[PDB]
Amino acid sequence: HMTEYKLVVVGAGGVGKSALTIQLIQNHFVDEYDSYRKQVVIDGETCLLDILDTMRDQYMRTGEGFLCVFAINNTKSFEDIHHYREQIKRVKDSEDVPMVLVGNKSDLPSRTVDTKQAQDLARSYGIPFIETSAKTRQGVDDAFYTLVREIRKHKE
Numbered sequence: 748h749m750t751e752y753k754l755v756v757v758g759a760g761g762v763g764k765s766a767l768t769i770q771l772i773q774n775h776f777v778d779e780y781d782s783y784r785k786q787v788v789i790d791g792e793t794c795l796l797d798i799l800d801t802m803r804d805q806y807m808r809t810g811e812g813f814l815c816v817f818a819i820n821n822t823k824s825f826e827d828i829h830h831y832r833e834q835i836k837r838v839k840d841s842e843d844v845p846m847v848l849v850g851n852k853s854d855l856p857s858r859t860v861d862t863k864q865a866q867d868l869a870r871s872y873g874i875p876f877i878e879t880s881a882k883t884r885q886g887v888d889d890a891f892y893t894l895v896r897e898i899r900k901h902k903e
């Protein structure tokens with residue numbers, strides 16, 4: 748019928764995991780803030796996205812792809828990515844897990860993490876880096892779509 752993709756958004760508090768997710772589902776930005784579902788067509792395949800915004804360690808073990816989110820104006824969040832990724836490495840017992848690195852809040856002027864740093868990090872892990880803003884919606888569809896396509900590159 749349709750095809751199910753189980754996605755997991757991880758990252759430090761306050762980076763905009765919820766805002767990103769709410770943006771994908773409901774097409775608005777919320778300033779103050781479980782599992783979600785969205786039917787989308789991506790490359791002519793109707794997809795049901797089963798999305799957790801982080802006793803829900805059963806999404807960690809079963810989840811097929813991970814958005815690793817930091818904010819570009821939060822250097823601590825960027826440094827923490829190493830830990831979120833090591834957590835996903837341990838749970839899946841492998842260094843080849845579908846993953847996208849996301850740099851959120853690209854609208855904000857107070858940028859403490861440079862695109863080169865992010866690119867250096869993503870290149871080391873062997874994954875895409877995408878800049879997003881949940882406020883303007885820049886990059887949001889592209890982060891989720893690319894993660895869907897990363898999952899396709901790894902098994903049917």
Ligand SMILES: Nc1nc2c(ncn2[C@@H]2O[C@H](COP(=O)(O)OP(=O)(O)O)[C@@H](O)[C@H]2O)c(=O)[nH]1
Nearest residue numbers: 760761762763764765766777778852880881882
């Ligand atoms: N300006 C701006 N603010 C954002 C963005 N994404 C999230 N925020 C704000 O950052 C705060 C934390 O967002 P939230 O979605 O709760 O992040 P989470 O804790 O990782 O789920 C909220 O006040 C959001 O409005 C963004 O892209 N741009």
Ligand SMILES: [Mg+2]
Nearest residue numbers: 764765800801
């Ligand atoms: Mg949240």
